[PDB]
Amino acid sequence: GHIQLIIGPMFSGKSTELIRRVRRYQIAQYKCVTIKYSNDDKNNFEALEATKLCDVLQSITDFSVIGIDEGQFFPDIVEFCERMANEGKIVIVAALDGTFQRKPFNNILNLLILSEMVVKLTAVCMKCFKEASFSKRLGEETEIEIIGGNDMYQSVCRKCYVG
Amino acid sequence: GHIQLIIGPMFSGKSTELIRRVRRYQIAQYKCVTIKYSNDNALEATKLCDVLQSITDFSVIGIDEGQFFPDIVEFCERMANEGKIVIVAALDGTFQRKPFNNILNLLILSEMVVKLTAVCMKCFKEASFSKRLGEETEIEIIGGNDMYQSVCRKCYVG
Amino acid sequence: GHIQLIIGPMFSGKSTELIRRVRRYQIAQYKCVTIKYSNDNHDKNNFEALEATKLCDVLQSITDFSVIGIDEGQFFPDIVEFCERMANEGKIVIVAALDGTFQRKPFNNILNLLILSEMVVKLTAVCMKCFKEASFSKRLGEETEIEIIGGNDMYQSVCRKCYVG
Amino acid sequence: GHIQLIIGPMFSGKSTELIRRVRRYQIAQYKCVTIKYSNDNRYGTWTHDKNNFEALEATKLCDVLQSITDFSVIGIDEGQFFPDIVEFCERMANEGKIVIVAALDGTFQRKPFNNILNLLILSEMVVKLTAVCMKCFKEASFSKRLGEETEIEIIGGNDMYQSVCRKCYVG
Ligand SMILES: Cc1cn([C@H]2C[C@H](O)[C@@H](COP(=O)(O)OP(=O)(O)OP(=O)(O)O)O2)c(=O)[nH]c1=O
Ligand SMILES: Cc1cn([C@H]2C[C@H](O)[C@@H](COP(=O)(O)OP(=O)(O)OP(=O)(O)O)O2)c(=O)[nH]c1=O
Ligand SMILES: Cc1cn([C@H]2C[C@H](O)[C@@H](COP(=O)(O)OP(=O)(O)OP(=O)(O)O)O2)c(=O)[nH]c1=O
Ligand SMILES: Cc1cn([C@H]2C[C@H](O)[C@@H](COP(=O)(O)OP(=O)(O)OP(=O)(O)O)O2)c(=O)[nH]c1=O
Ligand SMILES: [Mg+2]
Ligand SMILES: [Mg+2]
Ligand SMILES: [Mg+2]
Ligand SMILES: [Mg+2]
Ligand SMILES: [Zn+2]
Ligand SMILES: [Zn+2]
Ligand SMILES: [Zn+2]
Ligand SMILES: [Zn+2]
């Protein structure tokens, strides 16, 4: 078995790498699947959809490779990935390290300690136009988990993050 | 200006990175374009030198399968010198592991350069070379997995 | 300011990269320094390296250095906020540390550091058993207490299949 | 067998990575060696020997072949300087040997170094490092000679060359 990991802010190109990393295995004729967070499992166009990796476990039971965009949203992430890898399965996880508060996401960091490879990607800064490595919420909100595109958040460099 | 470069065999996930690298700039509200090679098996050309005129207003340019452009080097180059980000995806070597058409020359005037790995279609380990299945010759001949294989070293040898 | 980070097990080549990453800036005529924990068994050229147990002490003298290196960052409890604060003062902090222990448990409050870090990478060792990409550290002795220093005579860089005793 | 490759300008931190990459194997109890180029060589402030730690010295990889005949891993700072580079690395890898090569892609003229590029086509991994620019202090990716010289191969440290970004190179 084996575990990969990708992180960085948003607009990093995260989800995109993940898929690139998966196709690799699929195009070598591999049993590949993709879980992602829904916010209510449910198929799509290949790949599944859940809120807790622990449900799907049963069906993904025959796939060698598993991808997961937005891993942090699964509370049962860590032990899932882990256990799965221990069963000879390649788990490629894409997720955000930190929140709009630059605080570690839901029990996600813990994942990077039992991970064979880990990398952190860089976005371009939407302010000063240099290597963005952090995500910033535009609205004056609170509650950790709230989904959006660039109409809601910004990939910023350090100097830009500060208000 | 500035130049990026991505290489490796086929099935490396090359074209896919390229786009990922582009969207990054586009999703920061940039003038992005993509050239790619035509009459095979975003714009479309056979010589970067034609298109020059229209891409004249784009800050970022992508090019899957760069090697196919003879006028590659000096195009990318010149463009970068005009403040344009040129992200190129191409193959370093042929099915003969020989350098592609004047492509290597590009990697000397390139700010960043990386080589990707495929999975081997034989022993299922890190494939880093491309191999033609048919008993053919002529360098340039387009195909998918029905024609080529991403193989490790031990596998490449006939 | 700006923060780099390097992790992975032991024999990864961690400390070694760190230095490489530093010289880069130094050889561009930069104010460079290296903090490290009371430990090991480093090179040559110019203004370089201190020694502490708490980054918070040294703060005063490194006060004039643009770049700071730290092999074995996890050993500093006051790591996070130090690196952080420093970076906020326009200083480049390149940290080398271990993500996980011999129990593959996150090291002392270290992970927290990787959330306020511009670049983060994890290196691979070679496995001392099956001779493939080792990504985890394993203690040879039948010990416990998290922090206990050693070289290959104590630990091993192992792949997954090998980690399971 | 297997072949690694590192490039970029000077002050990139090339030679240093190479070693880091080697120790990895050595500290896993591997037969490791280091060739390097010699005839004008000092910097500053054939036959086996320590430092670089079990490392040799040559001008043509083809000589040493005989003794390195028993080493699984081989390192080579400044590969470009060996004309017989390509085929050496290559052949060696074909014999189950890990060849980690460090070299410069381009000259002070940003022209490909002596038959070096050819090497990167038969290479499992290849990466290009970045220096800091000695002028504008940003990612230097090219090497520039300070003197008003010509002849491709002429050895030196920062007292001779500079790691520069693009805008700075146009001297
Ligand atoms: C920062 C932040 C994001 N989110 C949400 C918004 C997004 O839907 C998601 C993060 O998006 P990503 O995982 O970055 O989306 P992506 O796959 O497009 O990757 P990238 O943009 O780098 O290429 O999490 C929160 O719910 N809370 C937060 O604090
Ligand atoms: C190997 C080889 C390929 N070709 C052709 C076949 C391909 O259609 C084309 C290059 O295709 P690719 O560049 O491999 O297309 P891709 O970017 O999707 O690859 P990847 O999956 O790694 O991302 O060149 C030759 O003409 N001669 C050759 O020797
Ligand atoms: C795994 C583990 C190691 N250690 C100790 C043993 C070592 O002295 C130290 C590890 O630091 P190292 O990674 O060995 O620092 P380094 O300079 O050797 O960098 P590298 O080898 O990657 O090139 O921490 C613990 O105290 N507890 C643990 O659980
Ligand atoms: C650019 C250039 C270098 N040289 C020489 C000078 C140098 O001593 C040698 C290459 O320098 P480097 O290989 O860069 O020396 P290094 O590996 O220790 O530096 P670093 O690792 O930090 O990148 O080649 C030429 O003869 N002609 C040239 O055009
Ligand atoms: Mg996103
Ligand atoms: Mg392809
Ligand atoms: Mg160590
Ligand atoms: Mg040098
Ligand atoms: Zn910015
Ligand atoms: Zn193979
Ligand atoms: Zn092993
Ligand atoms: Zn510059």
Author numbering:
A (entry chain C): 4 to 43, 54 to 176
B (entry chain A): 4 to 44, 60 to 176
C (entry chain B): 4 to 44, 53 to 176
D (entry chain D): 4 to 48, 51 to 176
Give the exact sentences the study uses for this entry.
The reaction catalysed by TK involves the transfer of a γ-phosphoryl moiety from ATP to 2'deoxy-thymidine (dThd) to produce thymidine 5'-monophosphate (dTMP). TKs of type 2 include those from poxviridae such as vaccinia virus (VV) and variola virus,, as well as from human hTK, (human type II thymidine kinase 1) and mouse. Type 2 TKs have a smaller polypeptide chain compared to type 1, being of ~25 KDa but form homotetramers. They are sensitive to the feedback inhibitors dTDP or dTTP, which are generated at the end of the metabolic pathway.
We report here for the first time, the structure of VVTK, one of the smallest type 2 TKs known, in complex with dTTP at 3.1 Å resolution. The four VVTK subunits within the tetramer are identical apart from a flexible loop (residues 40 to 60) situated on the surface. As found in other type 2 TKs, VVTK has a central α/β domain structure consisting of six parallel β-strands surrounded by helices. Above the α/β domain, a zinc-binding domain is present, the latter belongs to the structural zinc-binding class. Although no zinc was added during purification or crystallization, the metal is present in the structure and coordinated to four cysteines. The phosphates of dTTP bind to the α/β domain, whereas the thymine base and the deoxyribose bind between the lasso domain and the α/β domain. The thymine moiety is bound to the backbone of the protein via residues Phe-113, Ile-157 and 159. In the VVTK active site Ser-148 replaces the equivalent residue in hTK, Thr-163, a serine being also present in UuTK. Asp-43 and Arg-45 are only observed in the VVTK subunit D, they are disordered in the other three subunits, indicating the flexible nature of this loop. The Ser18Thr mutant shows a greater enhancement of enzyme activity (~3.8-fold) than does Thr19Ser and indeed in our structure, Ser-18 forms hydrogen bonds via its main-chain nitrogen to a γ-phosphate oxygen and via its side-chain oxygen to the magnesium and a γ-phosphate oxygen.
